[PDB]
């Protein structure tokens, strides 16, 4: 290779100024409103689409940019500095896309990727159920083959954009035999959202990220045609499992984005607030906080960068992604609470921007794999280096 | 009218119960205990009547270890005037039951010259629902069990009680025994002021030997297990 390098391609500086411009001029002024009401932020999403900073993984031959993972993270962080409600609605897109990208054929890729190119359509990742989240192999949604079709019966839970999606990627149980290993019991589908059997549930009310819609949805007798399975039967589990490589690093990039905001807000504030004669930053305790916060963001940034480079390069990045996701998530929380703190009573208030960050940050420890789960994956990956 | 109210110190219902390895009974050491919730209801009834000024005094009796001080004290805080603890060491506590207790409570009743014994309908520990009946039995007085409504009528009680289909309604002559059921009333709180005022009110600690009662039980628990 050449040296190590921590310098963006001019093209990437180019993408960065755009996402940062939008995030700073369009998202920021409105984000407190959308968090207050939960209104799904349609004008910004359209604008993000328009501005080219959405559906970025779609390959060129379906009429997208075919951007890389590093580029997607680069952008994510900027939108997430503005708002992660918004950034999460944008991402949900990639997440439903990813299995169509990695595992679909040309007719699928083109019909279903292609359409997001020509309208700001939304799509969704449909996996989690009331009874299984972390334990993917625990999902219970049924798929029975009946002719040239599949019938789907199941409930889904916590689905981002679940109520705004033109279509879903769906994981289901293909084979009834309980004893059937995960590498053979699931099938992956594209399901158009307006198919007869499908009932979106209500907008689900959460602590954080209150402007993306996440919803449960039920499939009663849903009809899904052969041409929409992903590799074939029993392939469902590898197919879902393989999307995370290209996407975990982006959600981590999200966490880093809210983390940076918190630091920024907290730093501006400590620069202007006085107590006992001096500005907050002249009290060592505060200084030191601002310092550790500065460290954590930096390290969390290199971490997700690292993960996106490994995959961009064409290796499997499971280990690096999972450090990124664990570490980014953990520090995002830590920094959110500390930002509230540095702001004192003001931080706990609704008119200042920090409590929101505190509420938004918790999800990074939960979805797209929890902290524990991140840690399982890493230990697994670590321990193999030590066997023959 | 003078009233006697029976109160039983039971494993607080909230405590989730654990069964002994030696499978002889359940685990009663270092285990929170309050006043059985039906007794709560009866103590409430003594007091509402004392409030309606139809009762001049309310005695509260309890049978077991010394920790039944705790139990009698709560009753005292709710409106009970003096307390009686009948003392049985936590050894003989084990093999004591509704028979013993009714025997106890009856001797007690005739002695303190009472006109009503109020009990809760069943203890959440042994689930017997036997004491009240048995006590009415020894005094030869009538019994309104599972009372859901009560009313003094001179020298007659009118008891509405809770029977399998709906309510039944009795008139009883007046030394009477009444056992409280859930729908009877909503029992009041011990107010912090009255919990303080209750320290002042005294509890005579006596023994079953004194009252004139034998504790020997030809019953016998053989084993206790978990459920299926």
């Amino acid at each position: 290779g050449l040296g190590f390098s921590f310098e963006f391609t001019e093209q990437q500086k180019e993408f960065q100024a755009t996402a940062r411009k939008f995030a700073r001029e369009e998202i920021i002024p409105v984000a407190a409103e959308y968090d207050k009401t939960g209104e799904y932020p349609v004008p910004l999403i359209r604008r993000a689409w328009e501005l080219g900073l959405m559906n970025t993984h779609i390959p060129e031959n379906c009429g997208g940019l075919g951007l890389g993972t590093f580029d997607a993270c680069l952008i994510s962080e900027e939108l997430a500095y503005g708002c992660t409600g918004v950034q999460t609605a944008i991402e949900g897109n990639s997440l439903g896309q990813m299995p169509i990208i990695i595992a679909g054929n040309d007719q699928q890729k083109k019909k279903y990727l292609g359409r997001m190119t020509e309208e700001p359509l939304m799509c969704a990742y449909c996996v989690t159920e009331p009874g299984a989240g972390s334990d993917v192999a625990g999902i219970k949604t049924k798929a029975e083959k009946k002719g040239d079709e599949y019938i789907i019966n199941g409930q889904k839970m916590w689905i981002t954009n679940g109520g705004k999606a033109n279509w879903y990627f769906l994981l289901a149980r293909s084979d009834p035999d309980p004893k059937a290993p995960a590498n053979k019991a699931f099938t992956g589908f594209i399901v158009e959202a307006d198919t007869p059997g499908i009932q979106i549930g209500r907008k689900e009310l959460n602590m954080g990220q209150r402007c993306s819609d996440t919803r449960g949805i039920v499939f009663e007798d849903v009809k899904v045609p052969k041409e929409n399975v992903l590799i074939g039967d029993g392939a469902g589990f590898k197919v879902a499992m393989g999307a995370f490589d290209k996407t975990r690093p982006v959600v981590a990039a999200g966490a880093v984005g809210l983390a940076q905001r918190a630091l920024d807000e907290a730093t501006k504030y400590a620069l202007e607030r006085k107590t006992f004669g001096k500005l907050l930053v002249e009290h060592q305790a505060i200084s030191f906080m601002l310092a550790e916060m500065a460290m954590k963001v930096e390290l969390a940034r290199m971490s997700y960068q690292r993960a996106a480079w490994e995959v961009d390069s064409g290796r499997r990045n499971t280990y690096y992604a999972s450090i990124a996701k664990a570490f980014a998530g953990d520090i995002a929380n830590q920094l959110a609470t500390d930002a509230v703190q540095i702001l004192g009573g003001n931080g706990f208030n609704t008119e200042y921007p920090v409590e929101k960050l505190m509420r938004d940050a918790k999800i990074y420890q939960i979805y797209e794999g929890t902290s524990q789960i991140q840690r399982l994956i890493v230990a697994r990956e670590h321990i193999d280096k030590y066997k023959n | 009218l003078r009233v006697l109210v029976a109160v039983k110190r039971v494993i607080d219902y909230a405590v989730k119960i654990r069964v002994k390895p030696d499978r002889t009974g359940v685990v009663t050491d270092g285990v929170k205990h309050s006043m059985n919730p039906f007794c709560e209801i009866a103590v409430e009834e003594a007091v509402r009547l004392k409030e309606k000024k139809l009762v001049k005094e309310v005695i509260a009796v309890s049978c077991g270890p010394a920790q039944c001080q705790e139990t009698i004290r709560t009753a005292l805080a709710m409106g009970a005037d003096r307390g009686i603890h009948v003392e049985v060491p936590p050894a003989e506590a084990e093999r004591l039951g509704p028979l013993q207790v009714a025997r106890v409570l009856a001797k007690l009743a005739e002695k303190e010259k009472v006109d009503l014994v109020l009990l809760g309908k069943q203890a959440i520990d042994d689930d017997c629902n036997q004491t009240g009946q048995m006590t009415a039995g020894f005094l030869d007085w009538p019994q309104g069990t599972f009372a859901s409504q009560v009313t003094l009528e001179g020298d007659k009680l009118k008891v509405e009680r809770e029977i399998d289909g709906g309510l039944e309604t009795l008139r009883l002559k007046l030394p009477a025994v009444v056992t409280a059921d859930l729908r009877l009333n909503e029992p009041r709180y011990a107010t912090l002021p009255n919990i303080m005022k209750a320290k002042k009110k005294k509890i005579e600690v006596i023994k079953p030997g004194d009252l004139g009662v034998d504790l020997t039980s030809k019953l016998s628990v053989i084993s206790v297990e978990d459920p299926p």
């Binding site: - | 119960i17 028979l99 959440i124 599972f146 289909g165 009795l170 016998s220 978990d226 459920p227």
Partner: protein, 184 residues
């Protein structure tokens, strides 16, 4: 060893919980006597007779047994106990059942046993305790077993194929320390 069953009833209608009681009764392996008390008894006495397990139906008819009051019925059951000497006196662990037996017991000066779900033998029983969260097994060594019986823990006995004698019960003096006034 003989057994006695207080039949619960109403408006000429054996209460179901009694059939279950009678199954539980025959488990003990002794002539099963069943006692019907009330103000119009003869009809139920007749159904009780048809029932399998039942060697003798005793009838105590009398106006005073309005509302089956435990102060009226207890000396009645006691009167029957003297003429006959049962080892066992049971009833369906219903509101009627639970109200009557512990008194009867007091009067006999034996300790009763509540709400049983199995019968390990003529002196060993199984109830629940603490909202049923444990299972208690009790050996009773009394001159008389008094106890009530959980309905759903035993099958209803065949209502036909019974060859029971129906006899006049022994009589008791109306107490009138309680009185029935009303229902729903």
């Amino acid at each position: 060893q003989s057994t006695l069953v207080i039949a619960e009833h109403a408006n000429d209608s054996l209460a179901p919980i009694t059939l279950n009681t009678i199954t539980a009764a025959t488990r003990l392996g002794g002539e099963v006597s069943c006692l019907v008390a009330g103000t119009k008894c003869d009809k139920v006495a007749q159904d009780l007779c048809k029932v399998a397990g039942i060697a003798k139906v005793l009838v105590a008819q009398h106006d005073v047994y309005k509302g089956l009051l435990p102060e009226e019925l207890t000396p009645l059951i006691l009167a029957t106990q003297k003429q006959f000497n049962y080892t066992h006196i049971c009833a369906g662990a219903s509101a009627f059942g639970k109200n009557l037996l512990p008194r009867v017991a007091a009067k006999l000066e034996v300790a009763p046993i509540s709400d049983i779900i199995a019968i390990k033998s003529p002196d060993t029983f199984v109830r629940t305790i603490y909202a049923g969260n444990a299972l208690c097994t009790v050996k009773c060594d009394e001159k008389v077993k008094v106890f009530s019986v959980r309905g759903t823990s035993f099958d209803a006995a065949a209502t036909s194929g019974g060859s029971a004698s129906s006899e006049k019960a022994s009589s008791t003096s109306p107490v009138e320390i309680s009185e029935w006034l009303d229902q729903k």
